[PDB]
Amino acid sequence: GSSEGTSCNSIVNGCPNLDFNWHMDQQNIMQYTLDVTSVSWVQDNTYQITIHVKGKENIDLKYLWSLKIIGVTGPKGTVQLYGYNENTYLIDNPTDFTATFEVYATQDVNSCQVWMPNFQIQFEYLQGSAAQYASSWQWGTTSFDLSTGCNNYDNQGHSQTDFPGFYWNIDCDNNCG
Ligand SMILES: [Mg+2]
Numbered sequence: 305g306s307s308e309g310t311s312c313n314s315i316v317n318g319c320p321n322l323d324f325n326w327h328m329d330q331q332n333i334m335q336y337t338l339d340v341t342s343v344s345w346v347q348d349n350t351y352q353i354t355i356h357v358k359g360k361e362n363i364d365l366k367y368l369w370s371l372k373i374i375g376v377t378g379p380k381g382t383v384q385l386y387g388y389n390e391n392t393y394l395i396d397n398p399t400d401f402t403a404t405f406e407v408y409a410t411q412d413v414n415s416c417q418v419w420m421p422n423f424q425i426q427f428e429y430l431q432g433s434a435a436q437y438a439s440s441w442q443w444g445t446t447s448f449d450l451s452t453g454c455n456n457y458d459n460q461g462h463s464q465t466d467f468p469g470f471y472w473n474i475d476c477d478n479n480c481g
C-alpha cells in the first residue's frame with residue numbers, strides 16, 4: 305500500500321564501501337560528504353529528498369559566490385542554494401548545509417526499490433565580490449562540481465564520483481515484499 309506523502313523508512317547507501325575521497329583528493333578539492341537524510345513520496349514517480357552536505361573544514365560564507373544542485377532529474381534540473389547574481393540566499397554555511405528538492409526516481413533496483421537519479425553540486429568560491437578574500441583562502445580548488453553515484457568506480461575500490469548513490473522503496477511503500 306502507497307499513500308501520497310508517505311516517508312520512506314529505509315534509505316539505502318548503495319555503495320558504502322567505495323573510497324569517495326580519492327576523487328576529491330586527486331583534484332585538490334577539500335573533502336565533502338553527503339547523506340540523504342529524508343525521502344518521501346509525493347505522487348507518481350516524484351520523491352522529495354533532503355540532503356546534508358558537510359565539508360571537512362569550515363569555510364565562512366564570505367568566501368562563497370554561488371552554490372547550486374545541478375543535473376537533477378526532477379521537476380527542476382537546477383536547484384539554486386546561494387548566489388549573488390541569482391539573488392538567492394538559502395544556506396548560511398557552504399560546508400554544513402541541507403537542501404530539499406524533488407527527483408523523479410524510475411530505475412528500479414528490484415521489485416520494491418528504486419535508485420535515486422544522480423546529480424552534482426556546483427561550488428563557486430572566490431569569484432565575483434568574494435574574490436576579495438583570496439589572501440585567506442586555504443582549501444584548495446575554488447570552482448568544482450561534486451557528483452553522486454554508485455555507477456562509476458575503478459578496479460582498486462575508488463569511486464570516480466564524490467558521494468554515494470542511494471535507493472529506497474518505490475512509492476515509499478514501506479511494506480513492499
Ligand atoms: Mg538527479
Ligand code: NA
Pocket residue numbers: 318319320321322
Ligand atoms: Na560498496
Ligand code: NA
Pocket residue numbers: 346347348
Ligand atoms: Na500518484
Ligand code: NA
Pocket residue numbers: 347348349350
Ligand atoms: Na508526475
Ligand code: NA
Pocket residue numbers: 342343344352353354404
Ligand atoms: Na524531505
Ligand code: NA
Pocket residue numbers: 393394395396
Ligand atoms: Na544565506
Ligand code: NA
Pocket residue numbers: 414415416
Ligand atoms: Na526483484
Ligand code: NA
Pocket residue numbers: 426427447448449
Ligand atoms: Na564547476
